Amino acid sequence: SHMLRPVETPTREIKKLDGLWAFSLDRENCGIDQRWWESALQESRAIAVPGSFNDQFADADIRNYAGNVWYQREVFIPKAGQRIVLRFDAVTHYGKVWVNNQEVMEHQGGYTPFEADVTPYVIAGKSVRITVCVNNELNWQTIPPGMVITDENGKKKQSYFHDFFNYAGIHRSVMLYTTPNTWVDDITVVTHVAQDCNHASVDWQVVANGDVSVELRDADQQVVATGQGTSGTLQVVNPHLWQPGEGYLYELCVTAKSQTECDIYPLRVGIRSVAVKGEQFLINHKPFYFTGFGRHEDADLRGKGFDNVLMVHDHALMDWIGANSYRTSHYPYAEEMLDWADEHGIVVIDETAAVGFNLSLGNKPKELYSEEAVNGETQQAHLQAIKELIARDKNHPSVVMWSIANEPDTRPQGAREYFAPLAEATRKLDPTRPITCVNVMFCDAHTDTISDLFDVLCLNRYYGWYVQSGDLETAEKVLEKELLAWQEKLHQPIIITEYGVDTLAGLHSMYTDMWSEEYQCAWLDMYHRVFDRVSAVVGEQVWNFADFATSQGILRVGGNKKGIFTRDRKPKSAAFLLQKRWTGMNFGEKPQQGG
Amino acid sequence: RPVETEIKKLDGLWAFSLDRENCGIDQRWWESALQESRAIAVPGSFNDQFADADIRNYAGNVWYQREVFIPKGWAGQRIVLRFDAVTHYGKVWVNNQEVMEHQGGYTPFEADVTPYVIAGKSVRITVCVNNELNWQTIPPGMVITDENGKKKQSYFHDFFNYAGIHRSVMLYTTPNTWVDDITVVTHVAQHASVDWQVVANGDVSVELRDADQQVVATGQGTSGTLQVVWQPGEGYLYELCVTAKSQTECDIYPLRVGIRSVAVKGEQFLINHKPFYFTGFGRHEDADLRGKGFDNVLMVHDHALMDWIGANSYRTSHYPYAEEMLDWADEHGIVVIDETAAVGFNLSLGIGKPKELYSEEAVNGETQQAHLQAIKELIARDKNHPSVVMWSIANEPDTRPQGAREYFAPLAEATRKLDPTRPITCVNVMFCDAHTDTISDLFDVLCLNRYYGWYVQSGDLETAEKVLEKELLAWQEKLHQPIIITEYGVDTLAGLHSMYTDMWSEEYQCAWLDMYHRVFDRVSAVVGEQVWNFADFATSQGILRVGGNKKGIFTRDRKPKSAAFLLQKRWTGMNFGEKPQQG
Ligand SMILES: CCCCCCCCC[C@@H]1NC[C@@H](O)[C@H](O)[C@H]1C(=O)O
Ligand SMILES: CCCCCCCCC[C@@H]1NC[C@@H](O)[C@H](O)[C@H]1C(=O)O
């Protein structure tokens, strides 16, 4: 449907985000049968929302549990005559909500919010019970996809194809918000600029039988433009347009009035224009250079759960290190991260949860794009995730790119058949932004067959790590050669969205061999040397802020160790190399082929 | 503590600013939006939040600010602003009008803002937080200055001086007849529970249930309340609805209470007339990244670790914990020794200054008063909790200089008169043994901190066993009192191993915790053990702290050392609430 983030005005929120819900497992799938919605928690225990249920009890048998978990919470209802709505900003994978024995709504998104209108079903003044059924399972039509395997005892074991651990549960806000019966439930805003001198910001919104008078107030509450109608444009003059450095943000207050009731919604948008020209990524008609991380929503104890201290601290670290950009790696991030990126002018490459469409990253199906794995319904679900992501992050000026999928195996015939309609559909959904598909390493420029449909070429390369293990002299030649081959092929702006190596924070060696910090430094350094002599490399993005948790494997030593920082946010030796490089260059500009 | 039948203002981010030049109160920064502010998260200590070295140690004035919408549904009700905890000092302003202030730090403070607030429009909230300690703050300290005005704070406890807003901020609403004060005391012989009440223009009607609304008693009055006929295993707790009735509005307040009576008999600690044995940790309000800020995920996880390792009790070490810890504590029925921030009254703990600890320039007058205040507040907030079985006035004070007894006697007297239903204690330091301590008689349970084999007799088990044994049974023969060892632990690097089982290695933590447990087992007066710290925690910079205090069974990110499984074998291998029969 339509997605508007709620905000306090003559509108109200009761943060049911309160922790300490009742939590229980359903190892027998008796919950849907035995009507657990009715009343009690049976044999529950205290859990905390937001937060992943896997790491929260230090029980291994819970963290690998694959099935149905039950959340439970009684709450009181203060808003009368207002539309009361129950919003879940994120319930990872599947969630079915119940308000006092009655199914309200359900979702199969994972990292996208879903809400429901509960005005008839509640009465402001008495209690009410909310029971959530959260499913953490992945089959071939989920985004991301997976394979759940039962064995001889019927015990479910979830296997997937991405790297990060499949943290599940309620990860973001659960809120009970309250809006007048004539609401402003959808908005779209597109901005243009000409020579940083003047241009318009077209408006568009959806009401509940009310008219929309829209004003454009300033950063100090000064009206600069008005407008009367459901559509149309409106022009500023000599704007304070949104730059990657500062990030100026106008406050467009929209009004939807009825003959009796009225609703006012303030929506912050910044004037900026993002486009791709040849091999240049232009923000406000200036060629840009991306620097920063591909991070994860990962932490100790809470898993993929959200928390504010992590936001302010992580943004302080990136702010110190000189990073100006990041990419919401492998799933839509919490909207709060994108609000911060909006105010602080942080350019973001947004991505969907489509990751793992690849069976070469080592009882696996034998054809990746057959009916037994990634079929038409996988394509429908992928288009769904695109729809929801764009419908949530469409107005945020910090998003400059949509990324449909991550590292798909494109060698087999049919990858183009699967991905081309999704490129067409995404271009038809949001024309204001470039589109991309992050490229796997074993699909170099001479075997890929998908990168033509996208505006920006994103690359994940690990020459010298997975291949040429320990060889810098050779990985330099290979890396430079394939980079110039991508240039000779597509003449596109090339952002390296992943490049990193594993490093035991504390492992040193005089020989600068793999897994030591000296190898991380020398490796990133050589990669930077190659980066500086390719004209079409419009951005670099290291593989990963900090070490994150992965599934158990013989390649993951307590998870992925390719982070610049540790899981507790401590810098390895390479963090200060990146400090020197990024903070030493001119902001938003590519190095002049050398310092 | 609020319930209803509110809008939690601690949601999201606040504007944060520093006052290095100390211009805030003079230039009236609360009457405007903070110039040059940055986003900060509440709850959470401001020191660790920005990875800034200069912000972490800053000693002065910090400014929080946040606009909020007051809901329309609270038209004619009193609107109250509650700060569950603002560490050390806080002065709160509501939209150009000064409302409140408090020098507590680890206890809440609330203020009535009904006139200054018009429910429906947005108002701004500005908080001035101070993190300074002199000799009259609890805990005490002293600040020093030089040229360029750089302020540098020095204190006498171990843990790092985290500050800021550490617990939720509430904005609750009650009808014009509210239940401001409640008290409940439970008895049990081989019983019932007197009730209390304070209100304004309202009568008191008290009823109480069990599982769900199943009343099993009642009462109409501010006394008596006795009727029909809470354990450390599960923790059965009844629900006591209090009603305050007026001509127009009515108030209902639910208070969970568990039937229990704690008392000391000879050298036994009796909870419900049964001898007990304390096992568990002396923990801290410390975490990665957020300082002393509260968080539910951490409480759930740490309670999972304590449940797994077999702990049955712990002590809110060196300051009042967040009350959520105590609600959980009486829910799952874990025994809690509650303690004030009174720590650091000692000049002998020197890493290797006034001249006498109980002089006028240090610890005299307002110091004793404000200590009695920290008592009064801790008790006024945690009195009704059945999980609290003990009072702890102070921790590790130097009682050797002249005038210590003259200081500690009145505090014991007043505290005993305030809450006579629970035993009282004072954790004494190691440098004051049985032949030199002069205060352990004023208290019901004697608490001991002992580090034989670490600070003295460093690395020698064969003699530290003898010294610990002699000191222990000499205490027993001296005062014939119940002795809980509230601190015993040694530092340990998480990954350091050593074949020789020498200091700082995990083998030394294992073998050192073991000998202490045998000497514990051959002493009849030891009514419990609490390994020093649950998890490694942050302290001030010293040559004895290797990135904080490493005396934890778990690391800071909650990962177990070799001793965690030893203690999980010891505490769950014995019977719950029972001490081994000398083996
Ligand atoms: C057959 C040739 C294979 C080439 C190597 C492919 C490496 C893919 C790297 C992986 N790319 C995806 C990312 O989520 C992971 O964290 C990253 C990694 O594992 O470090
Ligand atoms: C004879 C006495 C020699 C010196 C003993 C010093 C004992 C001080 C105990 C200290 N008591 C306070 C506690 O927070 C600290 O963690 C603990 C410590 O040492 O780390």
Numbering used by the authors:
A (entry chain A): -1 to 77, 80 to 362, 369 to 601
B (entry chain B): 3 to 7, 11 to 195, 199 to 237, 242 to 364, 370 to 600
Q: Which statements did the authors publish about this structure?
A:
However, intestinal bacterial GUSs cleave the attached glucuronic acid for use as a carbon source, allowing potentially toxic compounds to re-enter the enterohepatic circulation. However, microflora-encoding β-glucuronidases (GUSs) are notorious for reversing the glucuronidation to release SN-38 in the intestinal lumen and thus represent the major cause of undesirable effects. GUS contains a deep enzyme active site (the two catalytic glutamates lie ~12 Å below the protein surface). To understand the underlying structural basis, we prepared C6-propyl, -hexyl, and -nonyl UIFGs (2–4, respectively) and resolved the eight X-ray crystal structures of 1–4 bound to EcGUS or Bifidobacterium dentium GUS (BdGUS).
Particularly, C6-nonyl UIFG had 23,300-fold higher potency for EcGUS than for HsGUS (Ki = 4.5 nM for EcGUS vs. 105 μM for HsGUS). The IC50 was as follows: 2, 1.2 μM; 3, 18.6 nM; and 4, 3.69 nM. Consistent with the aforementioned Ki values, 4 was the most potent inhibitor. Furthermore, EcGUS contains a narrower aglycone-binding site than LgGUS and BdGUS. Taking the comparison between EcGUS and HsGUS as an example, the aglycone-binding site of EcGUS is surrounded by five hydrophobic residues, namely Phe365, Leu361, Val446, Met447, and Phe448, which are located in loops 3 and 5, whereas the site of HsGUS is surrounded by Ser485loop 5, Tyr505loop 6, His509loop 6, and Thr599loop 8. This difference explains why substitution with an alkyl group at C6 of UIFG remarkably enhanced its binding affinity and selectivity for EcGUS. The alkyl substituent of the inhibitors therefore facilitated an increase in hydrophobic contacts with nonpolar residues of loops 3 and 5 in EcGUS, e.g., such as Leu361, Phe365 in loop 3, and Val446, Met447, and Phe448 in loop 5. Interestingly, owing to the longer alkyl chains of 3 and 4, Phe448 rotated outward in EcGUS/3 and EcGUS/4 and thus increased the hydrophobic contact area. This additional hydrophobic interaction might have compensated for the binding energy loss owing to the absence of the water-mediated H-bond network, leading to the observed lower Ki values of 2–4 for EcGUS compared with other GUSs. Similar to the previous trend, the entropy contribution of 3 and 4 increased with the length of alkyl chain (–TΔΔS2–3 = –1.32 kcal mol−1 and –TΔΔS2–4 = −1.34 kcal mol−1 for EcGUS), while the enthalpy contribution decreased (ΔΔH2–3 = +0.04 kcal mol−1 and ΔΔH2–4 = +0.99 kcal mol−1 for EcGUS).
